[PDB]
């Protein structure tokens, strides 16, 4: 896994670049997916210049004459199984090339060697050939390239016309060639011996290797591509393709001519994201622009409102963002035009990219800084690439442009500043809009009648509407969702309940938003779409709004500006139309919209304003979906906009789905009317109405940003009309016809059910004489309201059965719970065998079945210490496993109590915050667990209120007492599957006895992610559902996010069985498990272990009060008081009895079924049947996708291996064989070795042995020291304890000092280095992630996210990048250099010192929660002096030495940064 | 290698024709391409009438109502990978 590029600065061809490229490719085997075969790869490739002399000598040998001009060589993949396909494709190519007039020299068969390819990469091997085309018309180079591209496109279209499969073209150009395949990285020069020749010289080279998630290789899917190479993985392609489908219908350029007609469907079928992006990039380059300009137009920079860039770049970025929608997502790009060679990064800067210049006029860049062997007596400058940066090389003139120079050179071509001034805003327009013409308020009775028509209850106004207008933020709930799903319910559930949101597992990182809110934009532009292949002032003349949500006054001002060009459309249908009225209304509106747009209209306003006692309202979602889809399919969406006036919009989940369907702006007038009516009654107090509306809009925008950030999208323009949702319970026909791209794995109600529901509610509201709204139960149980999973009687009967220790009571409980109408997916299936029953005394005993149950993790921040300890003691008494969850654990509980009641936990979590993760915390467990996403709040981090953090929890988490703690949504360690494999390797090295468990959340597409994580040596997968509890979460994320585990579990099982991977991992599920029938169904689906969770809380005393976030739980389960902790009533015997009953129920059901063990039934799906609710409901749910049986064949249907999956040994092994006196005598040692980038986690296993022997703080500092010489790998010294000292001479790659636990690391350049130590990058990204103790001294600059989540470490580094010291909690950090934007963002504890020569810190710092001043206390001066002296002592630096020389005049050049919460608690105050 | 057809002259359904068809198919192994594997064939097939009662009982078991008219059953090959 990795990209890389080598370029000769002067621009002269030579063999050196090609041989160095091959050498660099030969050393990326550690990141790839190692396999037991050793021959099976997943894709590799190189992209070089054309060796003219080679092919000219070939042609001479054949017998022709070598031409004067350059040659053209096309590489093709033809089918191999047939002999007509080959002949048909050859004929097509030859009649399509000769139609232009060029001369064909002949074909050539590339020599290959099939000795190195495995099996499954050989059954689909294509026939590789080359065609030699010469130019005889004497045309120029640009024209020749243009005709070659047109010929390639026409050949592709013609071959696709005959549906001729297995055909591909890897290149057809006169400048460059591509050698790629499905072999290992190191075996590239063995499969293709041509590259071993002496005449293959070039002036540039690009190389790439990928890491696929599945095990079925397809040769045309290997990178690099033609004029592109991509690392990372793009988020928004389902939205960008839809917008390209509208951009195609107007684009045209005189360079192509009539031939333009054969490039209309630019994005073909059967491509990945890196293919579609490549196609768009190539089209935009071939039409006049240059590679830097296209890179800026497609992947722009983050336009911030700060004074740290010249206005030139701001105008340029405004133009670029106005002309095109960005292509977001983690992306490290290495692209090349015919002239330029560019290496660039995305907006957030997630992937790493490091480069190097040598004195030979040679630049080498890649993902790792130790791939090519180069002595430091040859280097000139080392560097990196920040967020949005780029580095370019011009080969025609032979020059090297860095970031700023390239920006200044690019902002000169056109007068951008004079062009941008054509933009017009709306606040100017709303201020010129006079305070006249406002209509009179609606009547109270009319408002209530309209609200009742949509099903709005008073709890929708007192719970989720009052906090918005009162506070500026959204509501909060603290328990799982036990409500029935939308289709199985019986009340009126709006259409916006059928759409579950999306999020990102390991393959993509979610974007945190409370700290990097500067890179997220909500800009909206009307009058924007047009020709994308143009450059003129008319392209930036449009209307611009600051937010897609508009109030009523703003809507009237915008309607003023629109005026005489807009067309309004009715969206109501007659109630008496008949059984097919809604379909006819849809037809009518989607015909009128098209007939009006063709008439010159440019704005369509879709209103339901005429809703009355005889006209029901069409659901706005369906209307906008139909209209947008029809406009896209009729080549008219490019002309107009789409404005929606709705009467149901009240929650932040409505606007999200409306903008996701395709609407441009959304206006909710009924909500504003309700706000005004509630204000006139004197309910908000003394605040004006405008302040309330402003607070409501701010809360809506914040919630929209939250919803947009769960997936990884940072701009609204690329999120609109993409359909980032899933419909569960809608007909396949309806979704596939009216909605762009959503999957309905189980079809549901069609149009008749929606019409029936709408008409029923409308009649109930308008013919029935209403006087007030129902109280309604959706978040809280109400008798008049909706049904729930946990009612009162069930809980009381369960608690009684548990406390009296009687089984018949528990069977009464089971009979009560297994008799309600269906409420979940697992209620419709039915067990049915064909064998004869066997007696009860023959099945497995209760012990072997109880050891299959575990309890999920529940943090100590949420639960009380007593309940946590009770669970830990109870679960260890019966032999099962418990969980500690996030928030760490008490060290003093690490030994059995004196009743033998051991309070330890057999499962430790590695949360996203690493709040208590140390070296001892990971060596005191049997079985580990990685938590990627939680069941209740997927794509989000756990929260903890500011008053829940007592002194004990503050000490246990190494934080500040009385401070809100919100975990970061992403992981900062897991940005792609390769980083997940790296982290799994780290965890398996730090603890040599435990297993690694990955926790996911059920959704569509989880199958490929599961097949990918299974290749990363993970051995337990956990699939949580959407109905899981939580400690504190927003209500929208609780009710409108996730999917039932019935889908995800079956999908993962089938996908894992398909890839012959099921026999290596185990499956575990939880979420909503209550009885034995549920467990048996889950075991039939494929699971092997089961988690219970909330039921345990009910066995200990919790009665579902749903006030966990208030710190006032009456029983005292989730509490941190003393008054309330004294009211605990829990006992372990209760939980033991619960588990015993639950296991013996499974025994009962199995004995009645006809089996004697759970292994007899796991995976046997054919024991389940589906019966529907009857001929009176007519939901067409087909669970057959859920009951499909994939045949294993040879393998079993469960795990059959012993122990974990061991991994290859790093250098640590040798160290353990050398430092034996330290482990036997306990004496001092000193070792020296040679490091290389193919050695990961150097010094971690040694730390494990030291921890097991002496402990974290048993050895004096510097007991054992190691000296490494060379560029080290990743995770250097991760989880190092005190007493270990690593000294690297050279540089480190990434994640150096991750989770430092008291050790000491020192990084310095070589003594023979001609480099300024304060101007060259030495360490990479994410340094000191979650460290608790130790020291780290570096003699260079660090990367991005330097010292995130630092807790107790001390670091001295000569520079920093962007996002430095983000969300730091404790310790000291000295930065002797410059910093980037968003510095010290979210900092809540510690201290920082910056050394400012430029006096430009107030422009980069985030003055939100920290204060910056100058040093005024000698106590804080001795600290800095001693730290810099220690730095000088260790690294022998020269910058810091010269700073120490002139101390009196440089002490006044330092800024001191101190958090705001630490203003009372500091002990020597900072002021005078 | 071979074709074959069985028909009831009067035109009344019965299990006899289907079982005789299966029996006839079970005895054409001498003309085919025998292989060292013993499992690899090159194609075989049968074409019969629709068993209305079978699928009607299936639908009844599912939970719907068996219609009065005849049924329609489509057999499809979808991708597996
Ligand atoms: C009070 C509470 C605290 C929780 N804390 C965590 C946590 O810290 N980390 C985590 O991964 N899951 C946490 N969970 C979710 C559980 O791990 C598990 O997914 C959930 O309880 C399953 O729901 P169920 O009991 O209905 O089966 C918590 C759940 C609750 C109710
Ligand atoms: S709902 Fe929560 S506040 Fe206590 S009683 Fe149950 S754990």
Decide the pairing of beta strands A340-345 and A362-366: unpaired
Q: Which two tokens stand for residue A105?
A: 């020299």
3-class secondary structure per residue, A334-391: EEECCCEEEEEECCCCCCCCEEEEECCCEEEEECCCCCCCCCHHHEEEEEECCCCCEE
Task: Find chain B residues with C-beta within 8 A of A1172's C-beta.
Answer: 62-64
**Contact yes or no for A1170 and B64 at CB 8 A:** no
Our answer on whether the CB atom of A754 is closer than 6 Å to any ligand 1 atom is no
Cα nearest neighbour of A1177 on chain B? B64
How many whole angstroms separate alpha carbon A121 and alpha carbon A183?
Answer: 8
Ligand 2 centroid–CA A1228 distance in Å is 54
Residue A1170 at interface with chain B, using a CB cutoff of 8 Å: yes
- Residue A478 CA: nearest ligand 2 atom is 2
DSSP state of B17: H
Pick the last residue of a domain from A422, A437, A472.
A422
Of A216, A1058, A1172, the CB nearest to B63: A1172
Ligand 2 centroid–CA A1106 distance in Å is 5
Of A216, A1169, A1175, the CB nearest to B65: A1175
Angle made by CA atoms A10, A12, A13, in degrees to the nearest 5: 140
Spatial neighbors of A1339 by CB under 8 A, at least 6 apart, are: A1307, A1308, A1309, A1317, A1322, A1358, A1435, A1437
- For tokens 């308008």, the residue is A766
How many whole angstroms separate alpha carbon A1364 and alpha carbon A1345?
Answer: 5
Residues A728 and A804 in one domain: no
Q: A1130 CA to chain B: closest CA distance, Å? A: 46
A615: preceding bond cis by omega (within 30 degrees) = no
- Residue A243's SS3 state is helix
Q: Which H/E stretch holds residue A439? A: none
Residues A268 and A208 in one domain: yes
Cα nearest neighbour of B64 on chain A? A1175
Which of A862, A1030, A1116, A1118 to probe ligand 2 with, by most ligand atoms within 8 A of CB?
A1118
How large is the angle between the packed helices A652-661 and A620-633, nearest 10 degrees? 20
How many whole angstroms separate alpha carbon A560 and alpha carbon A512?
Answer: 38
Our answer on whether the CB atom of A857 is closer than 6 Å to any ligand 1 atom is yes
Which of A859, A971, A1049 to probe ligand 1 with, by most ligand atoms within 8 A of CB?
A859
Residue A1127: closest CA among A1116, A1118, A1119: A1116
Residue A1252 at interface with chain B, using a CB cutoff of 8 Å: no
In this structure, the residue with its CA closest to atom 3 of ligand 1 is A858
The side-by-side arrangement of strands in the sheet containing A907-910 is A853-854, A1089-1091, A1066-1070, A1020-1024, A997-1001, A927-931, A907-910
How many whole angstroms separate alpha carbon A1250 and alpha carbon A1216?
Answer: 11
The side-by-side arrangement of strands in the sheet containing A1229-1234 is A1229-1234, A1264-1269, A1284-1289, A1301-1308, A1333-1338, A1354-1357, A1372-1375, A1391-1395, A1454-1459, A1410-1414
Residue A759 at interface with chain B, using a CB cutoff of 8 Å: no
Residue A1169 at interface with chain B, using a CB cutoff of 8 Å: yes
Q: Which two tokens stand for residue A589?
A: 């509106």
**Contact yes or no for A1172 and B61 at CB 8 A:** no
Q: First CA to last CA across chain A, in angstroms? A: 56
How many whole angstroms separate alpha carbon A736 and alpha carbon A1065?
Answer: 36
How many whole angstroms separate alpha carbon A777 and alpha carbon A1106?
Answer: 14
The side-by-side arrangement of strands in the sheet containing A204-209 is A176-181, A44-49, A204-209, A2-8, A362-366, A354-358, A379-384
DSSP state of A1405: B
- Residue A1024 CA: nearest ligand 1 atom is 19
How many whole angstroms separate alpha carbon A553 and alpha carbon A482?
Answer: 40
Q: Which two tokens stand for residue A314?
A: 């701001």
Ligand 2 centroid–CA A882 distance in Å is 20
Angle made by CA atoms A22, A24, A25, in degrees to the nearest 5: 65
- For tokens 């996911």, the residue is A1000
**Total domains present in chain A:** 4
Q: In sequence order, what are the beta bridge partners of A668?
A: A646
In this structure, the residue with its CA closest to atom 4 of ligand 2 is A1113
How many whole angstroms separate alpha carbon A475 and alpha carbon A702?
Answer: 12
Spatial neighbors of A706 by CB under 8 A, at least 6 apart, are: A513, A1034
Residues A575 and A720 in one domain: yes
Our answer on whether the CB atom of A931 is closer than 6 Å to any ligand 1 atom is yes
Q: What is the domain extent for residue A279?
A: 1-422
Contact A349, A327 (CB under 8 A): no
- One of B1, B7, B49, B62 is an active-site residue; which one? B1
Our answer on whether the CB atom of A1111 is closer than 6 Å to any ligand 2 atom is no
Residue B58 at interface with chain A, using a CB cutoff of 8 Å: no
How many whole angstroms separate alpha carbon A1061 and alpha carbon A460?
Answer: 48
Which of A1097, A1109, A1121 to probe ligand 2 with, by most ligand atoms within 8 A of CB?
A1097
How many whole angstroms separate alpha carbon A1150 and alpha carbon A1081?
Answer: 11
Pick the last residue of a domain from A380, A400, A422.
A422
Ligand nearest to the CA of A482: 1
Our answer on whether the CB atom of A1115 is closer than 6 Å to any ligand 2 atom is yes
Residue A1175 at interface with chain B, using a CB cutoff of 8 Å: yes
Cα nearest neighbour of A1168 on chain B? B62
Exposure string of A401-411, with b = 16+ CB inside 10 Å and e = fewer, is bebeebbeebb
Residue B81 at interface with chain A, using a CB cutoff of 8 Å: yes
Cα nearest neighbour of B60 on chain A? A1171
Of B63, B65, B81, the CB nearest to A1171: B63
Residue A214 at interface with chain B, using a CB cutoff of 8 Å: no
How large is the angle between the packed helices A291-298 and A273-285, nearest 10 degrees? 130
Residues A773 and A799 in one domain: no
Ligand nearest to the CA of A1105: 2
Our answer on whether the CB atom of A1099 is closer than 6 Å to any ligand 2 atom is no
How many whole angstroms separate alpha carbon A924 and alpha carbon A991?
Answer: 9
How many whole angstroms separate alpha carbon A555 and alpha carbon A551?
Answer: 6
Residues A1146 and A1184 in one domain: yes
Task: Find chain A residues with C-beta within 8 A of B64's C-beta.
Answer: 1172, 1175
**Contact yes or no for A1174 and B61 at CB 8 A:** no
Q: First CA to last CA across chain B, in angstroms? A: 31
Residues A761 and A785 in one domain: no
Q: What is the CA radius of gyration of chain B?
A: 18
Burial class (CB in 10 A: 0-12, 13-18, 19+), A209: buried
Ligand 2 centroid–CA A1070 distance in Å is 20
Spatial neighbors of A1334 by CB under 8 A, at least 6 apart, are: A1280, A1282, A1297, A1300, A1301, A1302, A1303, A1304, A1305, A1352, A1353, A1354
Annotated binding site of A for [3Fe-4S] cluster: 1102, 1108, 1113
- For tokens 């190539």, the residue is A282
Ligand nearest to the CA of A1113: 2
Residue A373 region, left (φ>0) first, then alpha (ψ -120 to 50), else beta? beta
Cα nearest neighbour of B61 on chain A? A1171
Our answer on whether the CB atom of A1118 is closer than 6 Å to any ligand 2 atom is yes
Cα nearest neighbour of A1172 on chain B? B63
Residues A573 and A718 in one domain: yes
**Contact yes or no for A1058 and B81 at CB 8 A:** yes
- For tokens 């701001």, the residue is A314
In this structure, the residue with its CA closest to atom 6 of ligand 1 is A858
Residues A1294 and A1343 in one domain: yes
Contact A452, A773 (CB under 8 A): yes
**Contact yes or no for A216 and B63 at CB 8 A:** no
Q: In sequence order, what are the beta bridge partners of A1307?
A: A1288, A1338
For residue A875, what is the domain's CATH number? 3.20.20.70
DSSP state of A612: B
Annotated active-site positions of A, please?
1
How many interchain CB pairs under 8 A, A with B? 13
Contact A1334, A1297 (CB under 8 A): yes
Residues A733 and A871 in one domain: no
DSSP state of A494: -
Residues A191 and A324 in one domain: yes
How large is the angle between the packed helices A792-804 and A807-817, nearest 10 degrees? 160
Residue B64 at interface with chain A, using a CB cutoff of 8 Å: yes
Residues A792 and A895 in one domain: yes
Contact A345, A392 (CB under 8 A): no
Pick the last residue of a domain from A729, A753, A780.
A780
Decide the pairing of beta strands A1264-1269 and A1229-1234: parallel
- Residue A1093 CA: nearest ligand 1 atom is 25
Q: B22: how many CB neighbours lie within 10 A of its CB?
A: 11
Our answer on whether the CB atom of A932 is closer than 6 Å to any ligand 1 atom is no
Residues A735 and A761 in one domain: yes
How many whole angstroms separate alpha carbon A195 and alpha carbon A23?
Answer: 12
Task: Determine the residue among B63, B66, B76 to mutate to test chain A binding: the one whose Cβ has the most chain A Cβ atoms within 10 Å.
Answer: B63
For residue A1240, what is the domain's CATH number? 2.160.20.60
């Amino acid at each position: 896994c990795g990209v890389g590029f080598i370029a000769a600065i002067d621009g002269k061809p030579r063999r050196s670049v090609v041989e160095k490229g091959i050498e660099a490719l030969k050393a990326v085997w550690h990141r790839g997916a190692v396999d037991a075969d050793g021959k099976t790869g997943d894709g590799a490739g190189i992209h070089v210049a054309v060796p003219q002399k080679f092919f000219k000598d070939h042609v001479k040998v054949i017998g022709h004459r070598a031409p004067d001009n350059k040659l053209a060589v096309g590489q093709v993949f033809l089918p191999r199984i047939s002999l007509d396909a080959q002949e048909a494709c050859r004929c097509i190519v030859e009649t399509e090339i000769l139609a232009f007039g060029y001369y064909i020299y002949g074909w050539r068969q590339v020599p290959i060697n099939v000795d190195i390819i495995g099996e499954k990469a050989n059954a689909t091997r294509p026939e590789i050939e080359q065609i030699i085309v010469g130019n005889n018309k004497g045309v120029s180079d640009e024209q020749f390239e243009l005709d070659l591209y047109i010929i390639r496109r026409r050949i592709e279209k013609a071959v696709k016309g005959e549906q001729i499969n297995d055909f591909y073209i890897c290149s057809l150009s006169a400048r460059s060639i591509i050698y790629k395949g499905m072999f290992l990285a190191e075996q590239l020069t063995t499969f293709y011996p041509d590259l071993l020749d002496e005449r293959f010289e070039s002036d540039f080279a690009i190389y790439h290797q990928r890491y696929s998630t599945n095990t079925f290789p397809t040769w045309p899917l290997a990178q690099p591509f033609r004029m592109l190479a991509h690392n990372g993985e793009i988020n928004t392609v389902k939205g960008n393709v839809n917008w390209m489908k509208a951009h195609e219908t107007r684009m045209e350029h005189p360079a192509f001519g009539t031939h333009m007609q054969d490039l209309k469907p630019v994005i073909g079928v059967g491509l990945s994201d890196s293919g579609s992006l490549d196609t768009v990039f190539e089209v935009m380059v071939r039409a006049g622009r240059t590679a830097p300009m296209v890179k800026m137009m497609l992947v722009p920079q983050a336009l911030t409102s700060s004074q740290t860039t010249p206005d030139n770049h701001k105008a340029l970025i405004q133009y670029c963002n106005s002309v095109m929608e960005p292509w977001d997502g983690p992306a490290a790009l290495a692209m090349t035009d015919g002239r330029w060679v560019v290496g660039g990064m995305d907006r957030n800067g997630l992937r790493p990219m490091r480069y190097t210049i040598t004195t030979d006029g040679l630049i080498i860049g890649g993902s790792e800084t130790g791939m090519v062997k180069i002595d430091e007596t040859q280097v000139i400058e080392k560097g990196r690439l920040g967020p949005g940066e780029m580095i370019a090389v011009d080969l025609q003139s032979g020059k090297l442009y860095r970031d700023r120079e390239l920006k200044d050179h690019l902002a000169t071509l056109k007068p951008w500043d004079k062009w941008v001034q054509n933009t017009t805003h709306l606040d100017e327009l709303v201020k010129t809009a006079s305070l006249k013409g406002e209509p009179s308020d609606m009547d109270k009775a009319e408002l209530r009648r309209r609200q009742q028509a949509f099903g709005l209850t008073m709890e929708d106004m007192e719970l989720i509407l009052h906090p918005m207008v009162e506070d500026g933020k959204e509501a909060i709930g603290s328990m799982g969702d036990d409500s029935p799903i939308a289709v199985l319910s019986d009340k009126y559930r709006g259409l916006h309940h059928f759409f579950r949101q999306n999020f990102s597992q390991v393959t993509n990182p979610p974007i945190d938003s409370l700290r990097e809110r500067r890179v997220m934009s909500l800009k909206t532009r009307l009058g924007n779409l047009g020709n994308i292949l143009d450059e003129d002032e008319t392209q930036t003349r449009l209307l611009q709004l600051e937010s897609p949500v508009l109030t009523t006054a703003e809507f009237r001002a915008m309607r003023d500006y629109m005026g005489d060009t807009a067309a309004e459309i009715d969206a109501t249908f007659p109630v008496d139309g008949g059984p097919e009225a809604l379909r006819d209304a849809l037809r009518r509106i989607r015909q009128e919209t098209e007939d009006a747009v063709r008439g010159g209209a440019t704005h369509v306003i879709l209103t339901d304003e005429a809703m009355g006692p005889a006209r029901a309202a069409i659901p706005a979602i369906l209307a906008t979906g139909a209209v947008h889809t029809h406009l896209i399919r009729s080549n008219l969406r490019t002309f107009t906009s789409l404005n929606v006036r709705t009467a149901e919009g009240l929650d932040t989940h409505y606007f999200a789905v409306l903008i996701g369907v395709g609407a441009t702006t959304v206006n909710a007038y009924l909500a504003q009317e309700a706000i005004a009516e509630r204000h006139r009654r004197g309910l908000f107090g003394s605040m004006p109405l405008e302040k309330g509306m402003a607070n409501y809009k701010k809360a809506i925008d914040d919630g929209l940003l939250k919803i947009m950030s769960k997936m990884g999208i940072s701009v609204i323009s690329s999120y609109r009309g993409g359909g980032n949702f899933e419909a569960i319970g809608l007909s396949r026909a309806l979704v596939a016809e009216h909605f762009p791209a959503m999957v309905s794995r189980i079809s549901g109600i069609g149009l008749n059910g929606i019409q029936k529901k709408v008409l029923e509610q409308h009649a109930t509201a308008y013919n029935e004489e209403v006087v007030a709204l129902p109280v309604g139960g959706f978040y809280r149980f109400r008798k008049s309201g909706d049904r729930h999973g946990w009612e009162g009687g069930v809980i009381h009967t369960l608690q009684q059965a548990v406390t009296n220790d009687s089984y018949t009571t528990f069977k009464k409980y089971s009979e009560q719970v297994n008799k309600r109408p269906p409420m979940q997916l697992r209620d419709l299936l039915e067990l049915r065998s064909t064998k004869a029953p066997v007696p009860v005394d023959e099945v497995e005993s209760i012990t072997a079945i109880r050891k299959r149950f575990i309890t999920p993790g529940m943090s100590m921040g949420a639960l009380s210490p007593e309940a946590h300890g009770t669970l830990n003691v109870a679960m260890n008494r019966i032999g099962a496993k418990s969980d500690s969850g996030e928030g760490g654990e008490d060290p003093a509980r690490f030994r059995p109590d004196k009743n033998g009641d051991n309070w330890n936990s057999a499962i430790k979590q590695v949360a996203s915050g690493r709040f208590g993760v140390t070296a001892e915390y990971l060596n005191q467990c049997r079985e580990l667990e990685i938590k990627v996403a939680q069941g209740a709040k997927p794509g989000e981090g756990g929260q903890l209120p500011g008053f829940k953090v007592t002194e004990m929890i503050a000490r246990l988490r190494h934080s500040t007492p009385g401070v809100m703690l919100i975990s970061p949504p992403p992981h900062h360690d897991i940005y792609s599957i390769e980083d997940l494999a790296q982290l799994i390797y780290d965890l398996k090295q730090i603890n040599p006895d435990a297993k690694v468990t990955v926790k996911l959340v059920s959704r569509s597409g989880i199958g490929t992610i599961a097949a990918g994580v299974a290749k990363a040596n993970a051995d337990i997968i956990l699939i949580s559902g959407n109905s899981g509890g939580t400690g504190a979460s927003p209500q929208t994320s609780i009710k409108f996010a996730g999917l039932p585990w019935e889908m995800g579990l079956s999908e993962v099982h089938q996908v894992l069985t398909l890839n012959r991977l099921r026999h290596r991992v185990r499956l575990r599920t939880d979420g909503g498990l209550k009885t034995g029938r549920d467990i048996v169904i889950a075991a039939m689906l494929g699971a092997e272990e089961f988690g219970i969770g909330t039921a345990s809380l009910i066995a200990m005393g919790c009665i579902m009060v749903r006030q966990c976030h208030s710190n006032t739980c009456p029983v005292g389960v989730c509490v941190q008081d003393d008054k309330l902790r004294q009211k605990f009533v829990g006992t372990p015997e209760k939980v033991v009895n619960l588990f015993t009953f639950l296991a013996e129920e499974v025994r009962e059901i199995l004995a009645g079924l006809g089996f004697r063990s759970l292994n007899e039934v796991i995976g046997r799906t054919d024991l389940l049947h589906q019966v529907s609710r009857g001929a009176e409901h007519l939901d067409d749910l087909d669970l057959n996708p859920r009951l499909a049986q994939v045949d294993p064949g040879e393998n079993a249907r469960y795990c059959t291996l012993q122990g974990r999956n061991e991994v290859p040994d790093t250098l640590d092994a040798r160290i353990v064989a050398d430092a034996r006196p330290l482990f036997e005598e306990g004496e001092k040692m000193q070792l020296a070795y040679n490091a290389r980038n193919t050695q990961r986690a150097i010094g971690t296993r040694l730390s494990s042995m030291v921890t097991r022997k002496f402990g974290m703080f048993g050895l004096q500092p510097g007991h054992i020291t190691i000296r490494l010489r060379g560029t080290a790998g990743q995770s250097l010294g991760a989880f190092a304890v005190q007493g270990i000292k690593l000294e690297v001479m050279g540089d480190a790659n990434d994640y150096v000092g991750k989770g430092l636990s008291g050790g000491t690391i020192v990084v310095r350049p070589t003594t023979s280095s001609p480099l300024e130590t304060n101007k060259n990058t030495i360490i990479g990204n994410t340094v000191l992630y979650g460290a608790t103790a130790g020291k780290l001294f570096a003699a260079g600059q660090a990367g991005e996210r330097f010292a995130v989540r630092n807790s107790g470490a001390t670091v001295v580094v000569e520079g920093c990048g962007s996002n430095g010291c983000e969300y730091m909690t404790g310790g000291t950090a000295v930065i002797l250099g410059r910093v980037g934007d968003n510095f010290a963002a979210g900092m809540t504890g510690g201290m920082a010192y910056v050394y400012d020569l430029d006096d430009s810190l107030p422009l980069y710092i985030n003055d939100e929660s920290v204060i910056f001043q100058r040093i005024e206390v000698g106590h804080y001066e001795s600290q800095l002096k001693h730290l810099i002296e220690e730095h000088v002592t260790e690294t022998q630096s020269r910058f810091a030495a010269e700073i120490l020389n002139d101390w009196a005049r440089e002490v006044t050049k330092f800024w001191q940064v101190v958090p705001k919460e630490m203003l009372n608690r500091l002990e020597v105050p900072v002021h005078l």
